[PDB]
Amino acid sequence: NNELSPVALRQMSCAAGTTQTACTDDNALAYYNTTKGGRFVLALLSDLQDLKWARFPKSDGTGTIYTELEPPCRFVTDTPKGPKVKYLYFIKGLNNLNRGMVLGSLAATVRLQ
Amino acid sequence: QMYKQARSEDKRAKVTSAMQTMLFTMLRKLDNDALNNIINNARDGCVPLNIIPLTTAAKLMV
Amino acid sequence: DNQDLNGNWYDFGDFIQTTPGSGVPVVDSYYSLLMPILTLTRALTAESHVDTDLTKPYIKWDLLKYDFTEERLKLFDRYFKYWDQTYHPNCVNCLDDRCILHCA
Ligand code: BEF
Ligand SMILES: [Mg+2]
Ligand SMILES: [Zn+2]
Numbered sequence: 001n002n003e004l005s006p007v008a009l010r011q012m013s014c015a016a017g018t019t020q021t022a023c024t025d026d027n028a029l030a031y032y033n034t035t036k037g038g039r040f041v042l043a044l045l046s047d048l049q050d051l052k053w054a055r056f057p058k059s060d061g062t063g064t065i066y067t068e069l070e071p072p073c074r075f076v077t078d079t080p081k082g083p084k085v086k087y088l089y090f091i092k093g094l095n096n097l098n099r100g101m102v103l104g105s106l107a108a109t110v111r112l113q
Numbered sequence: 114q115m116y117k118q119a120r121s122e123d124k125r126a127k128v129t130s131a132m133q134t135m136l137f138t139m140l141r142k143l144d145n146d147a148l149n150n151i152i153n154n155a156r157d158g159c160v161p162l163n164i165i166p167l168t169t170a171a172k173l174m175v
Numbered sequence: 176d177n178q179d180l181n182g183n184w185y186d187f188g189d190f191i192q193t194t195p196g197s198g199v200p201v202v203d204s205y206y207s208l209l210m211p212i213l214t215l216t217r218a219l220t221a222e223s224h225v226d227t228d229l230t231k232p233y234i235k236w237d238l239l240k241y242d243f244t245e246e247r248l249k250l251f252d253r254y255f256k257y258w259d260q261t262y263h264p265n266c267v268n269c270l271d272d273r274c275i276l277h278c279a
Contacts, residue, residue, distance in 0.1 A: 003189050004201065073197045096259045100199045104191050112194075155239055164238050 005101040016054030023055040
């Protein structure tokens with residue numbers, strides 16, 4: 001019985017960027033893993049369909065960093081309230097284990113068809 | 114301590130002339146018709162060393 | 176323990192479902208635990224033959240060939256396709272001493 005993420009994750013907050021340049025103050029959303037280490041967000045989502053890099057804020061003072069993305073995969077991601085399209089880019093350089101925990105949490109515990 | 118600096122330089126000139134007398138006697142022995150025929154068919158001129166006695170030698174010892 | 180000794184797979188009871196096209200096989204304790212058996216049993220001894228057939232004769236290679244980098248990257252894709260970590264055939268392009276040990 002090898003189970004993926006036998007304990008769930010939490011946290012959703014802050015922003016990221018859409019224009020490598022812009023990321024003015026509020027672009028897209030970051031998802032999960034405060035990450036014991038400190039802060040390591042596993043995955044990213046968006047209400048839009050245009051995001052090249054993302055200056056996602058982080059702890060300390062040098063929190064600014066280019067948390068860029070890669071070719072996405074979109075889902076219907078039906079909100080309980082109603083339908084809403086959301087394109088899921090993954091953090092550049094994620095490994096197959098983390099993309100398993102993320103997918104397991106936001107699909108099996110959320111309303112997706 | 115200066116006889117010993119002389120001794121060593123005289124010696125340094127006797128080994129520098131013995132390796133030279135070797136690397137020029139193990140060279141006049143390369144049938145340079147069968148050796149320039151595989152360094153030429155090589156892509157860049159590099160070949161494995163284990164195939165030089167195997168394809169360009171004249172004598173076999175079993 | 177979910178692949179018998181013929182290659183057939185069979186416990187699908189701890190698998191989740193996502194949108195088609197994005198599935199993530201997690202193979203990291205399957206390959207790593209199996210690794211010491213891949214050289215004891217000499218698994219890849221049928222790759223020296225002319226059609227990967229244990230009956231047809233051996234491959235006669237060029238004697239002046241020494242690179243073998245395009246065939247090292249094709250052996251990784253045939254058997255270890257979903258092993259997610261960069262493989263450097265020539266370890267002079269590695270990134271630290273824990274990458275030299277992985278790629279060698
Ligand atoms: F792997 Be068993 F079906 F819990
Ligand atoms: Mg089982
Ligand atoms: Zn490496």
